[PDB]
From a paper:
Sugen kinase 223 (SgK223) (also known as Pragmin) and SgK269 (also known as PEAK1) are closely related proteins of 149 and 193 kDa, respectively. Both are classified as pseudokinases due to the substitution of critical residues within highly conserved motifs known to be essential for kinase activity, and both are predicted to function as scaffolds. A recent study found SgK223 and Csk were co-localized at focal adhesions where they regulate cell morphology and motility. Consistent with these findings, SgK223 has emerged as an important regulator of cell morphology, migration and invasion. To gain further insight into the molecular mechanism that drives SgK223 dimerization and oligomerization functions, we solved the crystal structure of the PsK domain of SgK223 and its adjacent regulatory domains.
Author numbering:
A (entry chain A), B (entry chain A): 944 to 976, 984 to 1029, 1040 to 1064, 1082 to 1158, 1208 to 1217, 1239 to 1335, 1346 to 1405
Write the structure that this text describes.
């Protein structure tokens, strides 16, 4: 059966799909895997917080029942999910009494949640400290923004699939976690009169907030917080402010923001389409029966991906990174149809 | 340029060749990298020998100048090479006085050579202890024999290229060494009247001895040691004894032995051709402008090889083995021409 050239090479093209799905499965294995009475088992590692997100403050802790691993103690300032890589996992909660010095009269009652992932900083912290870096090296920063946004989309989509809408997404509530075996791991933190806001508009709400976040990540102000015409009039995507063209990602990110900030909650782009767009900005086909051409591109990108992984197996300090995983997720589900969707969403 | 299907897939076919050559280079990195006065630096680990080859006895030792690694002390019973994976590397020598108890009147003067590789056993030891195993599970054993023979060919070829002919190859002088990061690593140990034996016949001598070794590895006697007609007459390959057909490798190994034992030292098969034949027996095309068909086979085998390596990069205890390296060496230099050579040498 190996006599026909393209019969064999069409046979190969299927086995790239095969391995890539297997690679994603194993990569998922790699990067992944209490009550008020059980709190005795815990022990804060130090007196300093590792992260402060306004909504809560974080302290690394160890558990005597679980030696070798570390937990994050989330102390909420306020007076249910299936597991995902980009979603904060709560392991139990209670009410404790905390010295006011730890929250930055002598003590306050706080809700204490036990988190599996220890945050290095928040997204707002990252934005706050990277203005000069964005100015100096725009392409590196804006690519990083696309990676964070991609992870954010993965989390939001997993939340939406199981009936959860985060009523307020903000940079302060997006946790950046260290990740090995550099690009951080993004994690979305947890929180008869009819409703003033319908369930319909809540469905396309994460998309709307994400559009605002794109501005905030690229060191631009919230458009509605600066332009009164956007608060008072029925605007259109043309009315939305632009971004300084500093790199290859700036136009595509501006386009994506406009697509996410469309006033009509029906013609607005879903979160899964935004994901595919970010994917296109990162690895996807650039400007250069078109499906056949795309089929070739997918096959070539898959072969080059398998090549990078194969060379990592024999290199003693090149190893598998989060970027490799995310890139595999894209190429494994890559189809010429969906790529076309994303290409003219980017109006290319 | 990615518009044409087979233009792209012919573009891929070149990049498999690219990576595979790179994989071989890095695999080579992985599996690879004194006087009488310096002997003070050394220290035998224990009182027991780790290997006895008749020609010499081996003792593991440590060096104070080189902590963390182990050396093998080769004590020769007798009263210059470039580096290769299958060739014993001497690091210095001298004459020492050894208690006669260590050689298995109270002491004897022995030549002591410092070896980089610590042997587990010899090939004859392996043959001696595996008769039942060969009887019980023939295919596993005979495949192992092909792997050892392959490594032996790699060593002999590297020796011949640099003007060295091992005047006596025997199973006792072939050292099996442990190898990680199971299939052992084979290592070839070191040693006016005109010459009775010409330089011409010495050129095809390693091939002749290898042919005898094939019989000895498969638990069969040396043909010349059992058949008088072979010692007294000008025999032909038809006169050479057969092997019991116990597995898929038995006919091909018998064929290879006959090819190596051809009486005429000119029509005899070289050591490099025997290598390609063993390669064919292990991974090569089986019985099922034929170059185009072979091109497809090479490309498919390369893609499957890159797949195995890529899946090893994300598997925490599947890792790169010696068999993977040897298989890469074959596929990286695989050409339809040379494969045809081997296929009808196996009279297929």
């Amino acid at each position: 059966n190996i006599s026909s050239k393209e019969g064999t090479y069409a046979k190969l093209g299927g086995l790239y799909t095969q391995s890539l799905a297997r690679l994603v499965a194993k990569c998922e294995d790699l990067f992944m895997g209490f009550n008020e009475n059980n709190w005795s088992l815990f022990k804060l590692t130090c007196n300093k917080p590792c992260c402060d997100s306004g909504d809560a403050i974080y302290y690394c802790a160890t558990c005597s029942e679980d030696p070798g691993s570390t937990y994050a103690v989330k102390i909420c300032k306020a007076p249910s999910v299936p597991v995902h890589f980009n979603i904060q996992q709560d392991c139990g909660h209670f009410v404790a009494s905390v010295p006011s010095s730890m929250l930055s009269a002598q003590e306050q009652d706080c809700v204490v949640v036990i988190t599996r992932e220890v945050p290095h900083q928040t997204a707002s912290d990252f934005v706050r400290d990277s203005a000069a870096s964005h100015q100096a090296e725009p392409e590196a920063y804006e690519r990083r923004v696309c990676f964070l946004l991609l992870q954010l989309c993965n989390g939001l989509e997993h939340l939406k699939e199981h009936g959860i809408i985060h009523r307020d997404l903000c940079l302060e509530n997006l946790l950046l976690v260290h990740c090995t075996l550099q690009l951080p791991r993004l994690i979305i933190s947890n929180f008869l009169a009819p409703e003033i806001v319908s369930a319909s508009q809540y469905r396309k709400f994460d998309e709307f907030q994400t559009g605002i976040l794109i501005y905030e990540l690229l060191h631009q102000p919230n458009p509605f917080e600066v332009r009164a015409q956007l608060r008072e009039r029925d605007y259109r995507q043309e009315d939305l402010p632009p971004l300084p063209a500093l790199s290859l990602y700036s136009p595509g990110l501006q386009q994506l923001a406009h697509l996410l900030l469309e006033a009509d909650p029906i013609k607005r782009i879903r979160i899964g389409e935004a994901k595919r767009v970010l994917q296109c900005l990162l690895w996807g086909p650039r400007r250069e029966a078109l499906c056949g051409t795309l089929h070739n591109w997918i096959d070539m990108k898959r072969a080059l991906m398998m090549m990078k992984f194969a060379e990592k197996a024999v290199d003693r300090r090149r190893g598998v990174e989060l970027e490799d995983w995310l890139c595999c997720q894209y190429l494994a589900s890559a189809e010429p149809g969906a790529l076309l969707q994303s290409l003219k969403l980017l109006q290319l």
